[PDB]
Write an enzyme that holds these catalytic residues in place. Structure first.
Site, short mmCIF file in Angstrom:
data_model
loop_
_atom_site.label_atom_id
_atom_site.label_comp_id
_atom_site.label_asym_id
_atom_site.label_seq_id
_atom_site.Cartn_x
_atom_site.Cartn_y
_atom_site.Cartn_z
N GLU A 35 0.86 -1.22 0.00
CA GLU A 35 0.00 0.00 0.00
C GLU A 35 0.88 1.26 0.00
O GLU A 35 0.57 2.20 -0.74
CB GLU A 35 -0.95 -0.05 1.19
CG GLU A 35 -2.04 -1.10 1.06
CD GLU A 35 -3.19 -0.74 0.13
OE1 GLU A 35 -3.31 0.44 -0.20
OE2 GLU A 35 -3.94 -1.64 -0.28
N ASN A 46 -7.17 8.91 -6.15
CA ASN A 46 -8.01 7.94 -6.92
C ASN A 46 -8.63 8.70 -8.10
O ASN A 46 -8.59 9.95 -8.08
CB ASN A 46 -9.10 7.30 -6.05
CG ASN A 46 -8.58 6.67 -4.78
OD1 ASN A 46 -7.48 6.11 -4.76
ND2 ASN A 46 -9.36 6.73 -3.71
N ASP A 48 -11.82 8.84 -8.87
CA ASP A 48 -13.13 9.41 -8.44
C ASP A 48 -12.91 10.82 -7.89
O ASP A 48 -13.78 11.68 -8.13
CB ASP A 48 -13.89 8.48 -7.48
CG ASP A 48 -13.23 8.22 -6.14
OD1 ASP A 48 -12.10 8.67 -5.92
OD2 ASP A 48 -13.88 7.55 -5.32
N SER A 50 -11.24 11.14 -4.55
CA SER A 50 -10.78 10.87 -3.17
C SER A 50 -9.27 10.62 -3.18
O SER A 50 -8.70 10.39 -4.26
CB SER A 50 -11.56 9.73 -2.55
OG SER A 50 -11.35 8.52 -3.26
N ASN A 59 -8.91 5.72 2.57
CA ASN A 59 -9.56 6.53 1.50
C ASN A 59 -10.34 7.68 2.15
O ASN A 59 -10.98 7.44 3.20
CB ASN A 59 -10.47 5.65 0.64
CG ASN A 59 -10.89 6.29 -0.67
OD1 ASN A 59 -10.43 7.37 -1.02
ND2 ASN A 59 -11.76 5.62 -1.41
CL LIG Z 1 -7.17 1.44 -5.28
#
Ligand SMILES: [Cl-]
Ligand SMILES: [Cl-]
Ligand SMILES: [Cl-]
EC number: 3.2.1.17
Length: 129
Positions: A35, A46, A48, A50, A59
């Site tokens: 991560e 991201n 979108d 976020s 997130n």
């Molecule tokens: Cl992701």
């Protein structure tokens, strides 16, 4: 802060993540690696709109407030910036809420693709925990 492998295993163990909802310590260290590469200061935007914050990339759509994720929830009731700190308490405590929400560690895309079904125990091997 960039953690060493064992330093983070001990940090997470101390914070009660070892076998939390049945997820062995190896699972959490593996997820942190893929991560964030163990960097508490990791951020990724991201598509979108976020942003993912910190060692477990929580997130801003669901979990934290970064002031720029419109109409989003703040289910950990924390500023996203609290997840970049060298102290992993906020990230760990919020992680506990995420993994308890019914989908376990499948919440973490990197865990599911790179940690699930592997020998995660290898991620704590040689650590004094
Ligand atoms: Cl992701
Ligand atoms: Cl393990
Ligand atoms: Cl992935």
């Amino acid at each position: 802060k960039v953690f060493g492998r064992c330093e983070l295993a001990a940090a997470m163990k101390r914070h009660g993540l070892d076998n939390y909802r049945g997820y062995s310590l190896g699972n959490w260290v593996c997820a942190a690696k893929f991560e964030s590469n163990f960097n508490t200061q990791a951020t990724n935007r991201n598509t979108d709109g976020s942003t993912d914050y910190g060692i477990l990339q929580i997130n801003s759509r669901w979990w934290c407030n970064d002031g720029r994720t419109p109409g989003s929830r703040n289910l950990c009731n924390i500023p996203c910036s609290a997840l970049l700190s060298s102290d992993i308490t906020a990230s760990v405590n919020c992680a506990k809420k995420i993994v308890s929400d019914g989908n376990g560690m499948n919440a973490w895309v990197a865990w599911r693709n790179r940690c699930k079904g592997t020998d995660v125990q290898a991620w704590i091997r040689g650590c004094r925990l």
